[PDB]
Amino acid sequence: GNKGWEAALSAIEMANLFKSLRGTGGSGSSMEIYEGKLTAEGLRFGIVASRFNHALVDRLVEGAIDCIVRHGGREEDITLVRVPGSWEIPVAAGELARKEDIDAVIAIGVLIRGATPHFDYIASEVSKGLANLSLELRKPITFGVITA
Amino acid sequence: GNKGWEAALSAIEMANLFKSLRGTGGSGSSMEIYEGKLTAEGLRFGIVASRFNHALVDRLVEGAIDCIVRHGGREEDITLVRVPGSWEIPVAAGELARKEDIDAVIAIGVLIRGATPHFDYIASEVSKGLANLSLELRKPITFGVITA
Amino acid sequence: GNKGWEAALSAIEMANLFKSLRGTGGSGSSMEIYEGKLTAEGLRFGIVASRFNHALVDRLVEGAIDCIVRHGGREEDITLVRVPGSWEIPVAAGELARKEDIDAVIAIGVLIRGATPHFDYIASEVSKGLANLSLELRKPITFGVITA
Amino acid sequence: GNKGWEAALSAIEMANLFKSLRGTGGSGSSMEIYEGKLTAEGLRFGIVASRFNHALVDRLVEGAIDCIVRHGGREEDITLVRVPGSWEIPVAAGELARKEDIDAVIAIGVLIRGATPHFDYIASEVSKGLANLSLELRKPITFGVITA
Amino acid sequence: GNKGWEAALSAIEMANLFKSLRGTGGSGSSMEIYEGKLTAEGLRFGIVASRFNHALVDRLVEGAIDCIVRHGGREEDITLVRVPGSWEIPVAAGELARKEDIDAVIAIGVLIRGATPHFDYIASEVSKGLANLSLELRKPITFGVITA
Amino acid sequence: GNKGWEAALSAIEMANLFKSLRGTGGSGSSMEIYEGKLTAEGLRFGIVASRFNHALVDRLVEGAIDCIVRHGGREEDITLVRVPGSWEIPVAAGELARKEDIDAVIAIGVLIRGATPHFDYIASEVSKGLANLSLELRKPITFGVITA
Amino acid sequence: GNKGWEAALSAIEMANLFKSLRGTGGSGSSMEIYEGKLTAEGLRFGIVASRFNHALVDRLVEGAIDCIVRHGGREEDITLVRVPGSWEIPVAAGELARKEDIDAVIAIGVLIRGATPHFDYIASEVSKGLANLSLELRKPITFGVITA
Amino acid sequence: GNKGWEAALSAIEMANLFKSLRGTGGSGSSMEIYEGKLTAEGLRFGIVASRFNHALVDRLVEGAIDCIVRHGGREEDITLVRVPGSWEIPVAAGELARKEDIDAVIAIGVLIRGATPHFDYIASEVSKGLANLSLELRKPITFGVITA
Amino acid sequence: GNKGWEAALSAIEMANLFKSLRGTGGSGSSMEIYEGKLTAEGLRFGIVASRFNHALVDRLVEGAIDCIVRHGGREEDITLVRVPGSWEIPVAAGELARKEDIDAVIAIGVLIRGATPHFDYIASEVSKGLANLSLELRKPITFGVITA
């Protein structure tokens, strides 16, 4: 039940939700409640991770993959991209999020804000970029990072 | 007292206010005051709610729906969407806020202040994101979220 | 006196100034020095005020409209819009700005920044929104926001 | 040595930098280098200044104009506009920049140290606005305000 | 030791990453893993650096050029631009980023943040500008600014 | 806040409730439920106030008139009468209620608990008589007296 | 968070596990492993709930239904039975566990710690009774009780 | 950064250095310079490792092979041979070097600190032997052993 | 900081001063004011510097050349001469001063006056020689010697 499991759980629910919204509406006669299920048969995902501190990141990525397969996901339908550092996560995510096949992208990384001097500037940028990216491209982007 | 009732009331008033300005002007030879009546007949709304603290959130949604119907709203013209967490609200509001039918949307959530660094960055982004979306689509968004 | 006195003065100098900037280009003998006059006739205005802390906002609006007429402003060319809460001022202001008639907007607002939690976030985004509109819409606005 | 002289020097050579940049591509057969010269003949500038604290601001504005003429600039090609406060520098700056003939802009101002609360909210916004305008207008603007 | 080396290495492989991600599609049963690579034949670069503290920056500029050529780069395909300030880099980088024959941009400078004036504000602003340009234009940008 | 606000709101709720019971039953095959909406259009009301302590009463009664118009009431359909003192409140209310036009009645007054021996008697008398008239006439009569 | 969620999830896993063992063996000619996925499609369930502590038991029962339907369960494949006493579950559970259609049973209840010696005997007997049913009848059961 | 990565880097560029050195003489009309590039494609290497202390040596050998593939080397052109002790590294190294196809050799090992007397006699000889072989064979060999 | 910059700036404008003073005459009623100017097109220069303490002087030589080219100078019209001592500059400057196609001369060197031998005497002598040459030949000479 590591934090990587949480990111996968959030990602799966949205891919179903947006499908329901884009689909045909209800028959009326009451409040149109829209909900996202946990099924994962026929959903494609993407993941981005940083090389830095590969001893503490390998566990996170591995735990995330177990969530999809257990909930009914084929291992063949996952794409993995690795980037040098945390600063480069947003730009990489954009290329993945713009593909037609992909339906969700997860973000995994570790932060050293406070662990090293002069890092709060970089720390705020990644959080701001990923959220702002989601609105323009119309697609859920789960967020996950650790503090060192 | 409960923020659910208070937030919905604000949404009702601004819906009428915008309809007045988009129409004809007021009487001349005087400073035309503008105010929003509290009636709610003929309008359409939407709601987005999170799931953290499942016990507490249920009360808030009940208050919001009660105020809308009590002031003359039709239950047939309310749509509800549920999301996993607080980070996820801004993207959900995007889909609803830009439909040609809806007139206003309400966001309900719970924020944690200072518990862990992870939640600290979440609070800043959700506040900024909701405001910018409203200014770009010309519809009102009500920020009815509790803290702690 | 009150901040409404100072706030009104700045707006008056601006509307005419922009008129000069779009004036005839028949010059160049020496360096130009553009400046704003203090005439008020033929200048439309808009004013927006909140509702919380009614005991204060009443004097600010009362103590601000006087300066407009004192320069020759006609009361028929002023429009006022009341709004429920401070956090939802900017959305209303944008609607009035897009009207081709009005040439200036001023806002009254009382904030308790740095008093209690859940209000610092509100106190932060209010200023940022108003500034953004001015550059986008190209019409001056005055930040007539006070605090306890 | 004052900010007025130093701030201007940035303006002269970027006007030369952009002119050469959009004139030709890579020469070929060797590394390409682009550089700006400190020559002012044939260039037209613009300057914006604040009304408040006219004592200090008087010296700074005088210094900036001295540099332009010294390096070979004609005084007939300089436009100066005054504003009553720092808050309105960004909106005014955009007006001059959109003019096709101007080739660069310079900003002068003075900031006070904590006379009243929430000054930073006003103080920080001017810096943020200037940077945003430069990128979208694609024309340099200098930053030469001085703290009190 | 040379941070130009560290910045240069990151830029080289990101160009390779984009070369493959947006390349021809592929079909297979196993998971697809996309990884960077240090190979710099057929890649076009561009560098921007400031004069500020010219004693130190001149050293770093040489280091970046050494990395490209040693790793298979071509001196004929490197373009260099020099500017007089740290505040004044983002505007320059914009023009280079839009060239259709440029694959990456490397930005290096010096910050003396601390008790010095004007530096607390601009230090934050320069970072945000670079990040936004990357997502807007979909092209990597590296941040190799060192501080005392 | 103003206790007249509360007393006013209760009047509308009761008026609609009796307006519905006279009609036909609701949908069968379930539990019949009757609730009062807050719409306040097309309803006639009456108000009674005591002249003693005109300072507090004036604000209190003004706090009640706004409610009917704000919730969609016609401003020219509420009657007002005043009486020398508290003792005269019941008889005045009795006169109004018998009319075939007024649908609800509101009472306003200010009292001090047991200031003098005779003040104790009136306190019991004023409440006792008011309730009895409501049952006899079959018409709601709100209670709005203030103690101390 | 609630025990109702945890109890339901265990039932989902066990049902899949038993369907695998009772089936044919797998290939590979190596070390062989079994595990239960979390797909609830096509499985039938049943629940038994007590009545003490009216406030809480309903909340726990609600969560259990959500888990089954979210993970692919059908609304009309669940059977519910309600009984008064915590001492009274085992007799009810047996009547349901022996139906051919049912494939799992979930028990929800509340126990009291140390209130009286009478309840001490109650608590011991209920736990061991349910265990014996599972082994005797060869069908999984879940133990979703709370105390204090 | 480890000796495995650092030791390899020496190997790649000398293979390039010798290839260019024996290709042409002095160009003439200017100073002649000979330099090696960090390109590995088209080159075949050899590696020798010690059996003892397999824990530490496992990481170093893994690091060296990572560098070759990263810079563009094919894994099919790498030969690894193990030996039981440091004393036999020189004799084994000569065997690989005399092979005509190999272009360079790399040595890895770990030395303990004074477990038994006269260790220096054995310890020093390996370093001396490696240097002697290089001169007479006329082929580079790297030195990458690490003390305990 | 670079004293070569400070020395260079003085030399540039003095050449302009002589260009106008001995130019064509003029007639007028007001006072005539002759002023220098920073404009270096069509001006021929010449630099002399010493090897003494070659670590530092090489830096200054570059600074002087940068000033001339940036201010509109031409590299084709700069002549450089190097000598081995501070005592030995004046003789070298004499030959350069007599060239009919030279407008100014810049002399830079290092003095280590103090407890060192021979330096109290020569330090005075070198200064006098330069001054006398200027008046004798009627051509400006600049003194940019720095000392520890």
Author numbering:
A (entry chain E), B (entry chain A), C (entry chain B), D (entry chain C), E (entry chain D), F (entry chain F), ...: 15 to 162
Source paper text:
Further increasing NaCl concentration to 0.35 M yielded a mixture of the tubes and ∼28 nm spherical cages ∼44% and ∼46%, respectively. The 24 and 28 nm spherical cages are composed of 24- and 36-pentamers, respectively, and both have tetrahedral symmetry, resembling those formed by the previously engineered AaLS variants, NC-1 and AaLS-neg. In contrast, cpAaLS(119) assemblies are non-quasi-equivalent, where at least one interface of the pentameric subunits remains uncontacted. While the number of pentamer–pentamer contacts remains 0 or 1 without NaCl at pH 8.5, judged by the 2D-averaged cryo-EM images, the mean contact number per pentamer increases to 3, 3.7, and 4 in the tubular, 28 nm-, and 24 nm spherical cages, respectively. The bonding network observed at the 2-fold symmetry interface of AaLS-wt is approximately preserved for all the interacting pentamers in the cpAaLS(119) assemblies. In marked contrast, the (pseudo) 3-fold symmetrical interaction interface of cpAaLS(119) assemblies lacks cryoEM density corresponding to the N-terminal α-helix(120–131). This finding suggests that the α-helix is unable to form the native-like hydrophobic cluster, likely due to the disconnection of residues 119 and 120 for circular permutation. The α-helix(120–131) domain is structurally disordered and unseen in cryo-EM analysis of the cpAaLS(119) spherical cages.
